[PDB]
Amino acid sequence: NQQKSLTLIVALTTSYGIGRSNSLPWKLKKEISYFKRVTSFVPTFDSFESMNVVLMGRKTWESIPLQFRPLKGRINVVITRNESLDLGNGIHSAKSLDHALELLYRTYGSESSVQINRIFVIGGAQLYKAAMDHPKLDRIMATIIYKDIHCDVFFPLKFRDKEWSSVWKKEKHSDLESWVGTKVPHGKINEDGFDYEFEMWTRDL
Ligand SMILES: NC(=O)C1=CN([C@@H]2O[C@H](COP(=O)(O)OP(=O)(O)OC[C@H]3O[C@@H](n4cnc5c(N)ncnc54)[C@H](OP(=O)(O)O)[C@@H]3O)[C@@H](O)[C@H]2O)C=CC1
Numbered sequence: 203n204q205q206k207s208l209t210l211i212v213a214l215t216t217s218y219g220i221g222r223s224n225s226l227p228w229k230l231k232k233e234i235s236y237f238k239r240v241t242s243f244v245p246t247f248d249s250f251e252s253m254n255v256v257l258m259g260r261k262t263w264e265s266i267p268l269q270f271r272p273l274k275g276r277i278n279v280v281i282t283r284n285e286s287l288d289l290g291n292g293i294h295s296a297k298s299l300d301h302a303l304e305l306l307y308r309t310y311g312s313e314s315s316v317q318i319n320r321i322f323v324i325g326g327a328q329l330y331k332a333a334m335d336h337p338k339l340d341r342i343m344a345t346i347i348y349k350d351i352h353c354d355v356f357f358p359l360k361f362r363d364k365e366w367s368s369v370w371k372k373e374k375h376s377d378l379e380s381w382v383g384t385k386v387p388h389g390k391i392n393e394d395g396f397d398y399e400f401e402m403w404t405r406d407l
């Protein structure tokens with residue numbers, strides 16, 4: 203198992219809502235563009251050898267548009283307890299998150315040209331719950347949607363809340379930029395009648 207820290211990436215409403223009907227309930231081209239920069243960005247000196255990983259629960263797998271997967275420029279892994287068959291061409295599936303990480307280490311060791319850079323968990327709610335409890339999860343890339351859209355699926359831990367304020371802290375914008383490496387818009391962004399904003403929350407292991 204593990205060596206490296208985990209990063210969770212989520213887009214949620216102020217009520218912690220994350221989806222409805224096996225879909226993320228909004229249409230945001232610039233917010234989806236953000237997901238893509240974060241999840242495929244590796245430093246220049248390292249982009250040479252290094253590739254990122256996206257860990258996801260299979261309903262999130264399903265939920266993705268046939269057109270966009272396997273997500274490109276990334277190692278895709280699907281967490282499924284009933285790993286029967288996985289339709290893909292180099293797409294891994296694992297029994298759980300620790301299984302996914304031994305799998306990757308094993309598979310991207312010394313007999314490889316492709317090294318792992320950063321590891322991201324992309325959801326859904328059941329995979330977000332297990333990560334939140336992993337001793338290696340130390341950062342949450344969150345996109346806050348300033349609107350109470352109807353959702354039926356919720357993020358499992360109210361991390362921006364008063365109850366978690368001694369563990370999870372919001373980081374300065376300048377450090378969110380420095381971590382993702384692309385400059386990023388500060389404050390509210392308006393796209394299709396929705397208000398949103400990017401944040402970076404961190405905890406000490
Ligand atoms: N807004 C955002 O940023 C995001 C929104 N979403 C939304 O969330 C929804 C998907 O959520 P959710 O239903 O909770 O499902 P998940 O995507 O977490 O997938 C559920 C499946 O994943 C597998 N799995 C997940 N965690 C584990 C574990 N700890 N151990 C073993 N297997 C595990 C199991 O598969 P099996 O049954 O095969 O055993 C479980 O059925 C959709 O609406 C999606 O759009 C999803 C991600 C990000």
Ligand SMILES: CCc1nc(N)nc(N)c1-c1ccc(Cl)c(/N=N/N(CCOC(C)=O)Cc2ccccc2)c1
Pocket residue numbers: 211212213225226233234236237238262265266267270273274324325345
């Ligand atoms: C709101 C997107 C998002 N933003 C952030 N900041 N975090 C998240 N976990 C997710 C996120 C959440 C749930 C799903 Cl199913 C998702 N699928 N990710 N898609 C594919 C995106 O394609 C690529 C290259 O990344 C579905 C999707 C497909 C096509 C268009 C829009 C969305 C992406």
